Design an enzyme around this catalytic site. Structure first.
Site: not given
Ligand SMILES: CO[C@H]1CCN(c2nccc(Nc3cc4c(cn3)nc(C)n4C(C)C)n2)C[C@H]1F
Length: 301
Positions: A22-23, A26-27, A49, A139
């Site tokens: 999905l992404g 650096a993490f 993650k 943030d």
């Molecule tokens: C930098 O780390 C971030 C990564 C994104 N994040 C998060 N929190 C809760 C749920 C979740 N799910 C999630 C994240 C998604 C997604 C679908 N579902 N599609 C994309 C493109 N992304 C991210 C990379 C922004 N993602 C909060 C932190 F874990």
């Protein structure tokens, strides 16, 4: 204060499947996946993650896991569990439409006043919940608000939350590293600005070291074209020097809610009302075996 009785769920690697990326930063990397627990007959869409292994990066992810497992609100992202592999991975709810920032940029031609004002209410609700739980986000930005459905958004990214993004920060935070729920209100104002401008970068071209001096003089983010003085006035109050003079999140819920009852009186968008975004009442709204799939919000143990 009060004991934190939240449960940290340890998940077996064998219980979930990584589907695609999905992404990646650096993490580490975020994957789209499915969580098929024990003998439950359920498939939960998840975001995984995954963290190289350095003792410092493992503590930072476990600090984020601690906070994320301690929250429970419809407008906040919770930790489903953690997997203790050689790497260490966070299991979270899949937010299929990604971050709100990219969503407003990619879908500006179908985003009406109703959606914008309802997103503002939802963010203020999630933020007011974090306040009740005595948590300072540190943030808040449109990049850290995820889209479950176009009609349902949630605050995420607890990697800085406690009990630097200069252009989203309150002046006391830039100058003295002071973080309060009222410094989160400033970041809320900037987030709203990002929504109202359909994803414009705050203070575009201005270097981060020039921001503090620009704010001290009294310069603030401009009035977005779609914003009536009513909506801009709210954004402006979130950017007062006196933190206590700024609105409270509970007042922001009230103010944006009154406005969301008559959205066209507060936001002026050409073609508004004739615009439509996907809803769970659309055909093909919900790749694998679609049998026994349950959203994380309905899966409770
Ligand atoms: C930098 O780390 C971030 C990564 C994104 N994040 C998060 N929190 C809760 C749920 C979740 N799910 C999630 C994240 C998604 C997604 C679908 N579902 N599609 C994309 C493109 N992304 C991210 C990379 C922004 N993602 C909060 C932190 F874990």
């Amino acid at each position: 204060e009060a004991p934190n009785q939240a449960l940290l769920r340890i998940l077996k690697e064998t219980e979930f499947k990584k589907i695609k990326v999905l992404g990646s930063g650096a993490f580490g990397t975020v994957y789209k996946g499915l969580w098929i627990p024990e003998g439950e007959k359920v498939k939960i869409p998840v975001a995984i993650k995954e963290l190289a292994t350095s003792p410092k990066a493992n503590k930072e992810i476990l600090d984020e896991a601690y906070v994320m497992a301690s929250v429970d609100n419809p407008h906040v992202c919770r930790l489903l569990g953690i997997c203790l592999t050689s790497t260490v991975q966070l299991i979270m709810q899949l937010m299929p439409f990604g971050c709100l920032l990219d969503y407003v940029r990619e879908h500006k031609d179908n985003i009406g006043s109703q959606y914008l004002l309802n997103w503002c209410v939802q963010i203020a609700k999630g933020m007011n919940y974090l306040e009740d739980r005595r948590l300072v986000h540190r943030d808040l930005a449109a990049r850290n608000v995820l889209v479950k459905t176009p009609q349902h958004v949630k605050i995420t990214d607890f990697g800085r939350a406690k009990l630097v993004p200069i252009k989203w920060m309150a002046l006391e935070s830039i100058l003295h590293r002071i973080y309060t729920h009222q410094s989160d209100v400033w970041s809320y104002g900037v987030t709203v600005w990002e929504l109202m401008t359909f994803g414009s970068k705050p203070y575009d071209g201005i270097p981060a070291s020039e921001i503090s001096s620009i704010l001290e003089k009294g310069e603030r983010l401009p009035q977005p074209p779609i914003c009536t003085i009513d909506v801009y006035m709210i954004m402006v109050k979130c950017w007062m020097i006196d933190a206590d003079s700024r609105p409270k999140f509970r007042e922001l819920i009230i103010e944006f809610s009154k406005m969301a009852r008559d959205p066209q009186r507060y936001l002026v968008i050409q073609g508004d009302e004739r615009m439509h975004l996907p809803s769970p009442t659309d055909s093909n709204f919900y790749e694998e075996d679609m049998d026994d799939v349950v959203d994380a919000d309905e899966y409770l143990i």
